[PDB]
Swiss-Prot record:
Record-listed Zn(2+) 3 binding positions: C66, C69, C92, C96
Subunit structure: Found in a post-splicing messenger ribonucleoprotein (mRNP) complex. Associates with the exon junction complex (EJC). Associates with the SGM1C complex; is phosphorylated by the complex kinase component SGM1. Part of a complex composed of SMG1, DHX34 and UPF1; within the complex DHX34 acts as a scaffolding protein to facilitate SMG1 phosphorylation of UPF1. Interacts with UPF2. Interacts with UPF3A and UPF3B. Interacts with EST1A. Interacts with SLBP. Interacts (when hyperphosphorylated) with PNRC2. Interacts with AGO1 and AGO2. Interacts with GSPT2.
Record region (C4): 66-96
Binding site for Zn(2+) 2: C20, S23, H42, C48
Highest taxon of the lineage: Eukaryota
Upf1 CH-rich domain residues: 1-155
Note on domains (UniProt): The [ST]-Q motif constitutes a recognition sequence for kinases from the PI3/PI4-kinase family.
Region feature (C3H): 6-38
Name listed for the protein in its UniProt record: Regulator of nonsense transcripts 1
Chain sites annotated for binding Zn(2+) 1: C6, C9, C28, H38
Part of the intact protein present: 118 to 272 of 1129
Chain intervals for the UniProt region annotation (CC/SHH/C): 20-48
Post-translational modification: Phosphorylated by SMG1; required for formation of mRNA surveillance complexes.
Role according to the record: RNA-dependent helicase required for nonsense-mediated decay (NMD) of aberrant mRNAs containing premature stop codons and modulates the expression level of normal mRNAs. Is recruited to mRNAs upon translation termination and undergoes a cycle of phosphorylation and dephosphorylation; its phosphorylation appears to be a key step in NMD. Recruited by release factors to stalled ribosomes together with the SMG1C protein kinase complex to form the transient SURF (SMG1-UPF1-eRF1-eRF3) complex.
Length: 155
């Protein structure tokens, strides 16, 4: 089982996993038996904010951070598409993605959208594991997560 396997379930598709900078562990973008996806569960429970994407994923090894100020809080970051072009930019909801800051010089502020929606990352950032790949993994519940998380913070 590879180093980048989800610390909850063991899914190891490079496109599906997300690295957590603070706790140095990988978590997938699938929801399993839980109501949120695994990284989001972790980021909420462990009280974490910063992540990195896999070398082999859609965006290569990228630390997700605000283009303007370098703030890395994933709960605040969102993306703005470029018009007639696919060279997206990542910015803080505030103040970096405001019409005060952007002034419509290079980016259209009204076009901002959170990186995390529906308690998980957008599929083009981190792909969602398939139906059968989620079945092959460890069928963990929300209560085992909470205990595993606590068993970790012991160390
Ligand atoms: Zn997982
Ligand atoms: Zn963490
Ligand atoms: Zn910013």
């Amino acid at each position: 089982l590879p180093i980048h396997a989800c610390s909850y379930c063991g899914i190891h598709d490079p496109a599906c996993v997300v690295y957590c900078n603070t706790s140095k562990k990988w978590f997938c973008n699938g929801r399993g038996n839980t109501s949120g996806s695994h990284i989001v569960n972790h980021l909420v429970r462990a009280k974490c904010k910063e992540v990195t994407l896999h070398k082999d994923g859609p965006l290569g090894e990228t630390v997700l951070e605000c283009y303007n100020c370098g703030c890395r809080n994933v709960f605040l970051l969102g993306f703005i598409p470029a018009k007639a072009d696919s060279v997206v930019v990542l910015l803080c909801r505030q103040p970096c993605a405001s019409q005060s800051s952007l002034k419509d010089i290079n980016w259209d502020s009204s076009q901002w959208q959170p990186l995390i929606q529906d308690r998980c990352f957008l599929s083009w950032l981190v792909k969602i594991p398939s139906e059968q790949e989620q079945l092959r993994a460890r069928q963990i519940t929300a209560q085992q997560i909470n205990k595993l998380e606590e068993l970790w913070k012991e160390n």
